[PDB]
């Protein structure tokens, strides 16, 4: 199977729905390789939990935690890590306000080679318990032979692009990981890397990151042929006073590039209320009333979470995906799984009369293009050549009584799955 795209295991659904699914313990298992060292890029971490996901025999190998925490939060993370002598930390610079280090990636160095995992889950128990999350698993990349002259590069330029992404951190502990990547053969890679890093990018540099990076790839490696754009995410930034300020101007413009209906998928209150977790699923859907009230126009694009295809309608999404289905939703021109939510912070916004792209955050995703497999389009696998779309198509519009889940207002009129109400404060 050419995609190597997986969902995480969900507790409390029938076993058949977890058969092709992966838990972090599966990923770190000895069947995947004899572990020597690892790097864990993420946003939230529970270190005690994380160490327990490694198999006992690998639990004392060096682990590098790449995080964005500052001040007190940084002090607390160092304190959780201290007991574990084998753990080092790298604080990613966040020079721009309201930026986060949001990338979820594992670099796994083995005796037998190197693996890269790009995924959507925080390193905390609740992200891997009852949520819909996505994982891309690289192949086992072998070491380049001791006396040989090869680039180890793929046709998608994945090796160079990943080194460029790590190089932007300007961090000593990542230079060692960059050197490790240099030494391995990543030529089998069939996905394109799409990254965001904090900065203001001018001229040629605009194409390197965020939605301009996606636009550049779609221009160069997709062919044109009414095909909608679908975006599916778990956090929503401040998008502006109306659809023309960013969403439908620069953002949709990048997404529809090749060589238009826009569907946005985001859980309603009813989706959350009746989920496996109930209202506490909302702790991972942090759309605030302060943001929502500025942009009620956005909610007309909102569609329900529905995932009968993967038995996950009650497993709230923390995966983020973007794609370009045909008018009948039976094929797609491309698919993207990423850490990037629907925000300018993650995707970039144009500044200074459109000569500057400003990005607040670190994000990372992988783009699946038919051309990378010698195809023109992918057929959609109707039941999770054939791409496994993890949710139902076509997406269903919010009903007249539906509202977007907003995490910081109370819900006290109907109890959730576990008989509880939601009263933040």
């Amino acid at each position: 199977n050419p995609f190597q795209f997986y969902l995480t295991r969900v507790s409390g659904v029938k076993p058949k729905y977890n058969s092709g699914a992966l838990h972090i313990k599966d990923i770190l298992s000895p069947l995947f390789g004899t572990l020597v060292s690892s790097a864990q890029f993420n946003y939230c971490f529970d270190v005690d939990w994380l160490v327990k996901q490694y198999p006992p025999e690998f639990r004392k190998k060096p682990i590098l935690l790449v995080h964005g925490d500052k001040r007190e939060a940084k002090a607390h993370l160092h304190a959780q890590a201290k007991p574990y002598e084998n753990i080092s930390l790298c604080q990613a610079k966040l020079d721009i306000a309201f930026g986060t280090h949001h990338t979820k990636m594992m670099l796994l160095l083995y005796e037998e080679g190197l693996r890269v995992v790009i995924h959507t889950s925080n390193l905390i128990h609740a992200d891997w318990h009852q949520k819909t999350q996505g994982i891309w698993l690289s192949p086992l990349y072998p070491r380049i032979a001791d006396g040989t002259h090869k680039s180890g590069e793929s046709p998608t330029h994945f090796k160079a692009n990943l080194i460029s992404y790590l190089t932007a951190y300007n961090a000593p502990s990542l230079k060692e990981w960059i050197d490790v990547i240099h030494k391995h053969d990543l030529s089998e890679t069939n996905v394109y890397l799409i990254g965001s890093t904090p900065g203001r990018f001018q001229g040629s540099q605009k194409d390197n990151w965020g939605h301009f990076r996606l636009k550049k790839l779609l221009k160069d490696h997709a062919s044109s042929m009414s095909w909608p754009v679908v975006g599916q995410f778990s956090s929503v930034g401040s998008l502006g006073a109306d659809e023309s300020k960013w969403l439908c101007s620069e953002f949709k413009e990048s997404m529809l590039t090749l060589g238009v209906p826009l569907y946005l998928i985001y859980p309603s209150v009813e989706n959350v209320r009746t989920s496996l977790e109930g209202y506490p699923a909302g702790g991972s859907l942090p759309y605030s009333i302060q943001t929502a009230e500025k942009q009620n126009w956005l909610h007309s694009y909102f569609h329900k979470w529905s995932a009968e295809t993967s038995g996950r309608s009650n497993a709230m999404p923390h995966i983020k995906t973007y794609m370009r289905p045909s008018p009948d939703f039976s094929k797609i021109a491309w698919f993207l799984v990423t850490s990037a939510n629907l925000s300018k912070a993650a995707w970039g916004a144009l500044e200074k009369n459109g000569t500057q792209l400003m990005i607040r955050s670190y994000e990372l995703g992988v783009l699946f293009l038919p051309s990378a497999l010698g195809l023109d389009s992918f057929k959609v696998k109707q039941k999770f050549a054939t791409f496994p779309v993890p949710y139902d198509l076509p997406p269903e519009l919010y009903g007249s009584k539906d509202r977007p889940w907003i995490w910081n207002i109370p819900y006290v009129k109907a109890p959730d799955t576990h008989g509880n109400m939601w009263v933040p404060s």
């Binding site: 946003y43 995080h67 702790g283 942090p286």
Partner: peptide, 6 residues
């Protein structure tokens, strides 16, 4: 950071 709300 242990989760989104701290």
């Amino acid at each position: 950071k242990l989760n989104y709300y701290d």
